[PDB]
Design a protein around this ligand. Structure first.
Ligand SMILES: NC(=O)C1=CN([C@@H]2O[C@H](COP(=O)(O)OP(=O)(O)OC[C@H]3O[C@@H](n4cnc5c(N)ncnc54)[C@H](OP(=O)(O)O)[C@@H]3O)[C@@H](O)[C@H]2O)C=CC1
Ligand SMILES: NC(=O)C1=CN([C@@H]2O[C@H](COP(=O)(O)OP(=O)(O)OC[C@H]3O[C@@H](n4cnc5c(N)ncnc54)[C@H](OP(=O)(O)O)[C@@H]3O)[C@@H](O)[C@H]2O)C=CC1
Ligand SMILES: O=c1ccn([C@H]2C[C@H](O)[C@@H](COP(=O)(O)O)O2)c(=O)[nH]1
Ligand SMILES: O=c1ccn([C@H]2C[C@H](O)[C@@H](COP(=O)(O)O)O2)c(=O)[nH]1
Ligand SMILES: CCc1nc(N)nc(N)c1-c1ccc(Cl)cc1
Ligand SMILES: CCc1nc(N)nc(N)c1-c1ccc(Cl)cc1
Lengths: 544, 546
């Protein structure tokens, strides 16, 4: 338990490994997916401004007031008193030798270098050199530092990991593939666990995030006022006994959960712990809550859930289908997009009292309201050109010609046509906001199937936001999701319980064909999802 | 380094005050301030009979102790006095107060009871209590006892003297938002000596709202911690309008430790917009600071969310609401009641600019009222009878709530894309969605455009009232009113007034009473509504142009 005494940590940054058998994509994913450390003396990627900023901020940050407990602990262990504190950076010759003279030594950091062929006289008096691994255990009990960061390379990391000389690991995850020759050791989840995950970012054309591994352990006035003000709160949660929190060992073991995906995950948890039991229109049971709001920064990442596998061909086609103004269910079925199949059958239509509606003729739904709101619906084959209000065209002109307008709204809930619809829309409306050349969008959803629908809904409107943004020569900003009746079907509980204990991966990114400048010109091949790392698919309905 | 007695011995005061039955009639405009709540007792007992919630609060505070903190407290008092079985708090009361406590509750449970008295001595008491005949003897006793905190619990004479001697570290003050007959009062609190540092959520108990505030005596694993500092390395960008808007102007707003009063959801949004809002031009040309996407939640079962940091009247908005329900679009109806909410939007000038050259003055077009009762019908003019024309959304939602409460399709939508250009102006309140659980009705309203300084305050009241109305005629109880804000903005000329407002501390919300006899949403009239116990700050003019 020495790595805990001298505060020895390891900070790194790994990308994804390429291949000669199969490059650019992987079948299965796990933490070991991120391991690329370097290539030909240098780093796999040119450089990463943000990670660089992170590295600096960590290896040069010290809390003088905390140096106390560490002193009152390091010496007592040493069995001897330690004879403007900084931190220490330990690296191998190769590592040091790769740093440019202009930047070496590393400012405000007590440099150290492992090597069996380097004179202590070939360098500074501030730059300490060692011949062995334990030779560092001493140098520490003799110096006055705050923390010790092992910054590589591969050789160094390996040795320290095996000898259990690492307290925690600050792992930067660069979500992109590069050529490599050296890699980071496979972290053993029995001797190291993740405790915190950060927000996701985009730097130098790649998303990345920061996670923290922790060696498995295996005024006060205001404080009291806080207790008084919570005197009327509830001891436990309603579904406490129904949903056992001990089933979320992973979810709770996390201290910092800044990864955007938790906005989705936290809501699942809030509904499971505090949701109300209700019986919906399907006899099936649900846990529901009312009113939530999620926000996703599309400029930093594409919010495609990573705690399970998601497909997008279908939802993109649906989006293209809406844009064309179609209401013909067959168009989608012939492309094997069966999102609306159950809603267009003879039985469903008849139960909806639409006895005179042809099978798969969904009536005046999304597409029809977006391009012909107000027009008289006849059948899915009629020509509606120039009939009704073309809201889509209108909001796009507004965005271009009057960005600050507060009436840029696309509404699908046409009260007059509701009963003619196979089913009323769940996505009531989209509202747009434009500022400093950036486009944001809010979408209000009246009914939210958290386990199955919402995941797609998020991807759906994020993609749409990008589309509207690109044809308006703007950059996407935020996709804002407002949930009204938010529910979790009971048959999704066990599945969500499993998903809740999975740690998100850095989000992927969405790439659109840059040449498409008309909302109506997009085709399926114009959409590409890049670097999508995810946990394996999950059957929400375990009942198979 | 002047060690203060109240700090060393942690002496606090906890009380509860109602409003006093003494209001002059000269000016029907009653002024309010903290001194509004001062009633302590009447004819030997409490002005109100009992208050379950405050009692629970009182009990929780005066019996709560933090074992792991005594250790440090003990050292503090020892060094002060030159000194080097379950832990309880001490409660101190005047003899009259002690005699007002029912026998089955004497002495106050799990608490070292101390009583001040000159007429009675220990021999006059059978209970396990300490008797003292002067203030200094309390300090002495405390110096000899093992206790967590010391609470002065009344009555008026006792509060009075302890406050005067500045022996109070903090005052846990409960505000009962109602009036009762009183003969004893809490002393007037001097603002230079005491400042409010925390206000609680608002609650309803025993037919009255109440909140809890705290006054403070005026001045004059470390691992997870560092990780946090790390995870905030890129928060480099502070606040864009912080330099434009000096947060030093929010001295009082920023001094409050705990801001749990529901009014702060609104107040916090104004603050967020002011510090981080985006500057933008407006269709009006005024210019605004704006953000996109907010949500506020108000518990209508616990209070009626009418802002107290400024004065508001609801006669107008109530008549507007009734006006909506009747499906009217005729502006004259409101103007004849001296409600000018829509006057500017129905002028010849305004209508012409909307390109509505063939629209009669004050004929607002197919707006809210028309959409709620006739969505889909072709608007003709405001005098037309649209009986059984279009979709009566209002009647529909009332039926879904009654016969299919779990429906996730209970929405009232005003945004009729087809009629938009025919309206004096498109609706700001896009839709209302209802949720029903355990005999309780909740309501979400989406506002596409929100003027925080002027409209929102009224909008919060309008829909909260509407929710009470729908719930009643549906035999349900009002639960939450959820307000979703799309484009939230603060007009540039409202800023100075909003700065003032943000530095005012909220009073407990009032309550709304509906004539319990009305069973149909259409049978309501202006005298079926009653706002009670509205305590508020001085009215403010958002636009100080003269
Ligand atoms: N992603 C990341 O965080 C990092 C990536 N890198 C990348 O990885 C590559 C360098 O890693 P790597 O090849 O492993 O080289 P190293 O930096 O790990 O240095 C290895 C050398 O250091 C000395 N050394 C290490 N451990 C000991 C020991 N226990 N006792 C005595 N001497 C020791 C020896 O040098 P000697 O010859 O003097 O005996 C040894 O040959 C580069 O391509 C670089 O770009 C480097 C650091 C961090
Ligand atoms: N709203 C609230 O939070 C509270 C309200 N109350 C209410 O207020 C009323 C009681 O208040 P009040 O009339 O002022 O009476 P008090 O409870 O304050 O008791 C006053 C009496 O206590 C003793 N006393 C006070 N100070 C001293 C001292 N320094 N030395 C010796 N004895 C002292 C003396 O009793 P003695 O005659 O024996 O000499 C004195 O007459 C009741 O109506 C009660 O219901 C009470 C507590 C809290
Ligand atoms: O894009 C969609 C489509 C449907 N649903 C869900 C919500 C409900 O669980 C069910 C529709 O039933 P109603 O809400 O209309 O009753 O489908 C979604 O979450 N997202
Ligand atoms: O009930 C209402 C009606 C209007 N407004 C405000 C919002 C805008 O500042 C202005 C209307 O402008 P547009 O959003 O329509 O452009 O009135 C409100 O806050 N609440
Ligand atoms: C800024 C890159 C960086 N980021 C992280 N998270 N860890 C590291 N160990 C390094 C690093 C790579 C090469 C040298 Cl030579 C020194 C430090
Ligand atoms: C429970 C009422 C209550 N609430 C608060 N907040 N403070 C108090 N001091 C009292 C109180 C009143 C009379 C007696 Cl006799 C004892 C305590």
């Amino acid at each position: 338990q020495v790595c805990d005494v001298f505060d020895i940590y390891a900070i790194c940054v790994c990308c994804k490994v390429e291949s000669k058998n199969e490059g650019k994509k992987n079948e299965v994913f796990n933490n070991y997916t991120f391991r690329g450390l370097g290539n030909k003396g240098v780093l796999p990627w040119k450089c990463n401004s943000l990670d660089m900023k992170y590295f600096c901020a960590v290896t040069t940050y010290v809390n003088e007031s905390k140096y106390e407990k560490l002193k009152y602990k390091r010496c007592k262990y040493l069995n001897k008193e330690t004879v403007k504190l900084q931190n220490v950076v330990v690296m191998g010759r190769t590592t040091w030798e790769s740093i440019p003279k202009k930047f070496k030594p590393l400012s405000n950091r007590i440099n150290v270098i492992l090597s069996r062929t380097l004179k202590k006289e070939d360098f500074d008096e501030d730059v300490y050199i060692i011949n062995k691994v334990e030779d560092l255990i001493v140098l520490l009990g003799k110096l006055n530092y705050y923390k010790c960061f092992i910054i590589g390379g591969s050789v160094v990391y390996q040795e320290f990991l095996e000898k259990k000389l690492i307290k925690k690991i600050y792992f930067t995850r660069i979500n992109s593939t590069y050529e490599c020759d050296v890699f980071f050791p496979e972290i053993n989840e029995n001797e190291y666990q993740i405790i915190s995950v950060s927000d996701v970012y985009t730097s130098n054309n790649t998303t990345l995030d920061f996670i923290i591994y922790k060696k498995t352990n295996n005024d006060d006035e205001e404080e009291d006022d806080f207790v008084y003000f919570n005197f009327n709160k509830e001891k436990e949660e309603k579904n406490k006994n129904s949903i056992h929190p001990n089933d979320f060992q992973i979810y709770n073991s996390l201290k910092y959960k800044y990864h955007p995906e938790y906005q989705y995950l936290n809501i699942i948890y809030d509904i499971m712990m505090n949701g109300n039991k209700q019986s919906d229109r399907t006899g099936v049971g649900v846990l529901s809550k009312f009113g939530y709001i999620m926000k996703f920064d599309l400029s930093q990442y594409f919010p495609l859930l990573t705690t399970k596998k998601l497909f997008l061909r279908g939802i993109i086609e649906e989006l293209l289908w809406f844009i064309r103004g179609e209401t013909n269910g067959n168009t989608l079925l012939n492309k094997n997009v069966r999102i609306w199949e159950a809603n267009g059958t003879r039985e469903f239509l008849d139960n909806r009292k639409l006895f005179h509606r042809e099978v798969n003729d969904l009536g005046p739904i999304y597409g029809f309201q977006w391009r012909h709101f107000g027009a008289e619906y006849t059948n899915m084959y009629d020509n509606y050109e120039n009939k009704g209000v073309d809201q889509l065209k209108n909001i796009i002109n507004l965005i271009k010609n009057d960005p600050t307008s507060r009436r840029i709204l696309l509404c699908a809930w046409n009260v007059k046509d509701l009963d003619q619809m196979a089913l009323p829309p769940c996505h009531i409306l989209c509202q747009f906001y434009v500022f400093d050349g950036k486009l944001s969008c809010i979408m209000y959803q009246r009914s939210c199937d958290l386990g199955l629908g919402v995941p797609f809904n998020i991807a759906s409107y994020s993609i749409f936001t990008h589309m509207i943004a690109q044809v308006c020569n703007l950059q996407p900003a935020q996709f804002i999701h407002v949930l009204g009746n938010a529910h979790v079907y009971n048959n999704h509980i066990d599945s969500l319980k499993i998903q809740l204990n999975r740690i998100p991966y850095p989000f992927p990114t969405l790439k659109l064909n840059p040449d498409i400048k008309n909302i109506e010109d997009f085709t399926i091949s114009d959409f590409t999802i890049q670097n999508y790392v995810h946990h394996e698919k999950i059957s929400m309905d375990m009942a198979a």
